[PDB]
Design a protein around this nucleic acid. Structure first.
Ligand SMILES: NC[C@@H]1O[C@H](O[C@H]2[C@@H](O)[C@H](O[C@@H]3[C@@H](O)[C@H](N)C[C@H](N)[C@H]3O[C@H]3O[C@H](CO)[C@@H](O)[C@H](O)[C@H]3N)O[C@@H]2CO)[C@H](N)[C@@H](O)[C@@H]1O
Ligand SMILES: [Mg+2]
Ligand SMILES: [Mg+2]
Ligand SMILES: [Mg+2]
Ligand SMILES: [Mg+2]
Ligand SMILES: [Mg+2]
Ligand SMILES: [Mg+2]
Ligand SMILES: [Mg+2]
Ligand SMILES: [Mg+2]
Lengths: 59, 125, 80, 135, 50, 121, 52
RNA sequence: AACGUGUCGCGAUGGAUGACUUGGCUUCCUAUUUCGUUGAAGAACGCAGUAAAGUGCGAUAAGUGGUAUCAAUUGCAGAAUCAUUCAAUUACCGAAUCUUUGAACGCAAACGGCGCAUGGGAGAAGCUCGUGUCAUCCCCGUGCAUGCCAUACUCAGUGUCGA
RNA sequence: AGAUGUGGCCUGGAGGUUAGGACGAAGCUUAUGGCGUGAGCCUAAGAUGGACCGGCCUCUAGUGCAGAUCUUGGUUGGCGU
RNA sequence: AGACCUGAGUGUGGCAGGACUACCCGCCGAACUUAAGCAUAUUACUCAGCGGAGGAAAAGAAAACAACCGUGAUUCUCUCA
């Protein structure tokens, strides 16, 4: 789950989740919040562990 | 801490300046995760010195692009295809106004009467 | 009746927000703003209300460019 | 003539201001022709016009305009004054020859004393209550 | 209801992020003027009508 | 600075709405007469870490080192000039630099360039 | 009306009258001035003070 | 008696008066003093370690550059050096940045919408001898409102000729 | 009703003069008396205040309240109804 | 075939559009009011409305005034009045 910029589509969020983070997004479900921000749920490709990515990010 | 001085930053090339811009956009992006997951007040708090040094790399990159493009259109007779972002921005009214190579244009007779009868300096006693 | 009961019969919106005016003055059936006359190129300005003239005037907002161009003229368009 | 555009010919108030059809505009049609050109072709500075032809319905005027951004006009001394931005719409302010006609500036002496430089320039001058300082 | 334009949703989102109180350290500055927020909007008392 | 003029309302506005480079000159202190007589300068803008002695107030006759020039509060902070709160914790008490003369200067080669500029010789 | 205009002779005859009364030492003294040690009224000094 | 009434002393309620005044109002003066398609004024949304409003600024976002100043800012944190520049801070200004709009101008519009040319990008399918290349899809730049002036090619006309 | 006179009183500021104030100015308070026909002035006491101000001669004006279904703020009987 | 004339289409280089509008230029243009009524007249060739510039604008270089012993572009001031 990431806050992304509110003027990106789901295709360019997948391509940024490949160049920053060396993982493969199979499904992005975006959501412009009542805060005003766009939140994306980004499911990884089951060849990539979610905790192993989230430790490298650190959270 | 890490803080790009601009005097050692203007001596870089266009490739090394971009390579240290991705270096510092990446370091800012992994402090936006410690700004959301708690964060010690020392690691966080390098957010201004990074974000103002990104502003120094981009102002060296952009001042080197307008310098190498203003010296691409004033070089020769290509100054009709000069894009208007590079032209001398004045007031809108001052660009349309008559230049002073113009506007002192005068008739062959108006030149003669200022040469046959010029305004004299004189006194009185 | 015309008092309390008829207040509940008011359902829609006459005006929505103006894309230019800023205000809740854009008429929906007649596509025109009650306050800045948008989409007309000129804005509403009437000397029978100078108090409204003094509210939509230069300097009531931010003046992003008249800040910079007034000192460009005051410093006589200097250039190194 | 000028039909007064009151709704349905109905107008109000004092009977001197009741007429609709016999009223006449205070600008001649040559000035009105020059203003319709220059309000329509904004990049051109019109200087004066002249009578061409009449019909029973229409009058025609050739209005001479000049392009102020043309490099010929800017470099030519006897026409480059038109490029200065005080002549931007000479027609809309009564500064052409037909404008100076309906202002009365064909006359100079005792026939124009109420209207030199303008009627408003003489109205203001003749009616402003002057307060001298020590009086 | 469900339909809103996104430009109305983003104006309604600004007013949620403005509806927060003055923090306490504002009240401890030198030339202080602000005790409370004077613009605390409540959804029932005053209507935005976007 | 030239704050004083004919109009009080304008003079008293340019004092209390002064930038911190104007507030530095306005927050000046005299020099001690063994130090005024050396540099031939009569007063000096106060820096941090230069030593002063206090001449007006309840803290008059107190020496010490300047630890903060708090220009927003128009005051100075000497370490040796302080008191305690209800907790027993100590807090530094502000003095205006009028009430204070300098007994040692903190010198840099931008501060040694102000003394050569104000040198009356 | 802020400013007033006074006749030219009546401004001159008022400057003269206030100038005549400076010679009277009773009127200079009854106006506040401490002239108790002054040599003479009208006091007149030399022009060496115009070079101090 | 009780209630009540009156007078003084002390309390409360109330927020006048005085003193104060970084504000208004009025007058007078000095200029290489007058915005915008090179996108203005206005409107919108954002930007701080902490930040609602306001101020300042624009994804370089409470600012970057340069000059002058010469050790702060300070509510609390943080911070190479503790100061001939190359990192205080403030003031000033030449170099820049300047989101979405708006005359608003590719077409629309209670749509963060959709084009036609053109260039760049990314590209886990294919093809290639993991590299390259890369179909749709998806991003980004630029050109394109209309009128007019000048201009250098393609035309229309049983307009007048002409072979 | 009205006119007029007043070395008649009072308030803000200005020109002059003469003086007060941290040993306590302005303001406020009154079973504080004094004296003026009166408008008013002055003293005293504050177990009040905390920094400005008086008198006289001239000059000037946004200069004197009890009521305008007066304006604005507050309070009150009705009423613990 | 070609020309000339009158019109098109694109390419290229430009410009106009909105803001301000105190003053100023062009138009448009009232009524309350005053006349102790009211209609001419007055308010006023003013308010409001529309268009257009500038640092000022507008005017200006005699188809002028005069009737003199003559004057000499415009603008403004005092006066004329
Ligand atoms: N005394 C009544 C007041 O008089 C004031 O005005 C007075 C004077 O200011 C005013 O004087 C005017 C003068 O101002 C103006 N500049 C010129 C005029 N010549 C003067 O008038 C003068 O001459 C006339 C006759 O010519 C006399 O009738 C008049 O009394 C005299 N003052 O005439 C009034 C006579 O005293 C105000 N109008 C006003 O405050 C009030 O009516
Ligand atoms: Mg005249
Ligand atoms: Mg559009
Ligand atoms: Mg009064
Ligand atoms: Mg316009
Ligand atoms: Mg009236
Ligand atoms: Mg009447
Ligand atoms: Mg008007
Ligand atoms: Mg002119």
């Amino acid at each position: 789950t990431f806050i992304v910029d509110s003027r990106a589509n789901k295709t360019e969020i997948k391509k940024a989740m490949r160049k920053l983070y060396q993982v493969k997004a199979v499904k992005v479900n975006t959501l412009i919040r009542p805060d005003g921000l766009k939140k994306a749920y980004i499911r990884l490709s089951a060849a990539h562990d979610a905790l192993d990515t989230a430790n490298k990010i650190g959270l | 801490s890490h803080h790009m001085k601009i005097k050692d930053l203007r001596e870089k090339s266009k490739d090394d300046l971009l390579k240290t811009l991705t270096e510092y956009k990446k370091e800012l992006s992994q402090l936006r995760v410690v700004q959301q997951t708690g964060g010690a007040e020392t690691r966080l708090g390098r957010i201004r010195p990074i974000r103002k040094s990104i502003a120094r790399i981009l102002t060296v990159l952009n001042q080197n692009e307008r310098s190498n493009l203003k010296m691409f259109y004033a070089d020769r007779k290509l100054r009709c295809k000069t894009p208007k972002v590079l032209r001398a921005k004045l007031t809108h009214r001052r660009r349309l106004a008559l230049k002073e190579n113009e506007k002192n244009r005068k008739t062959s007779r108006q030149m003669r009467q200022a040469h046959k009868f010029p305004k004299r300096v004189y006194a009185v006693k | 009746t015309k008092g309390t009961t008829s207040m509940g019969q008011r359902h829609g919106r006459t005006h929505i927000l103006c894309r230019r005016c800023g205000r809740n003055s854009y008429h929906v059936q007649w596509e025109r703003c009650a306050a800045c006359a948008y989409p007309r190129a000129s804005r509403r300005r009437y000397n029978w209300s100078v108090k409204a003239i003094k509210r939509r005037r230069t300097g009531t907002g931010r003046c992003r460019y008249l800040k910079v161009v007034n000192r460009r003229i005051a410093n006589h368009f200097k250039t190194p | 003539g000028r039909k007064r555009p009151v709704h349905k010919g109905i107008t109000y108030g004092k009977p001197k201001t009741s007429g609709v059809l016999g009223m006449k505009l205070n600008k001649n049609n040559q000035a009105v022709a020059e203003q319709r050109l220059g309000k329509r072709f904004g990049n051109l500075r019109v200087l004066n016009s002249y009578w061409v032809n009449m019909d029973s319905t229409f009058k025609w005027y050739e209005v001479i305009a000049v392009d102020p951004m043309c490099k010929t006009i800017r470099r030519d001394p006897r026409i480059n004054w038109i490029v200065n931005s005080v002549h931007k719409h000479r027609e809309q302010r009564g500064l052409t020859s037909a404008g100076r006609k309906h202002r009365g500036l064909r006359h100079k002496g005792h026939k124009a004393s109420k209207l030199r430089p303008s009627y408003r320039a003489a109205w203001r001058r003749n009616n402003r209550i002057v307060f001298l300082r020590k009086r | 209801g469900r339909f809103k334009p996104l430009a109305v949703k983003k104006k309604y989102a600004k007013k949620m992020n403005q509806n927060k109180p003055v923090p306490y350290w504002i009240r401890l500055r030198t030339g202080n003027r602000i005790k409370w927020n004077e613009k605390r909007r409540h959804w029932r008392r005053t209507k935005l009508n976007y | 600075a030239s704050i004083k003029c004919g109009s009080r309302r304008k003079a008293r506005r340019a004092h209390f709405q002064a930038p911190s480079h104007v507030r530095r000159v306005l927050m000046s202190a005299p020099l001690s007469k063994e130090l005024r007589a050396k540099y031939n300068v009569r007063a000096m803008p106060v820096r941090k870490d230069d030593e002063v002695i206090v001449k007006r107030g309840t803290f008059k006759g107190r020496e010490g080192k300047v630890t903060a020039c708090y220009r927003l509060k128009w005051v100075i902070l000497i370490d040796k000039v302080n008191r305690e709160k209800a907790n027993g914790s100590t807090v530094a008490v502000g003095i205006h630099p009028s009430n204070v003369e300098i007994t040692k200067l903190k010198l840099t080669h931008h501060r040694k360039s102000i003394l050569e500029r104000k040198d009356r010789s | 009306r802020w400013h007033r205009k006074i006749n030219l002779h009546q401004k001159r005859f008022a400057v003269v009258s206030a100038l005549a009364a400076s010679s009277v030492p009773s009127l200079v003294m009854s106006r506040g001035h401490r002239i108790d040690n002054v040599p003479e009224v009208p006091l007149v000094v030399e022009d060496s003070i115009q070079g101090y």
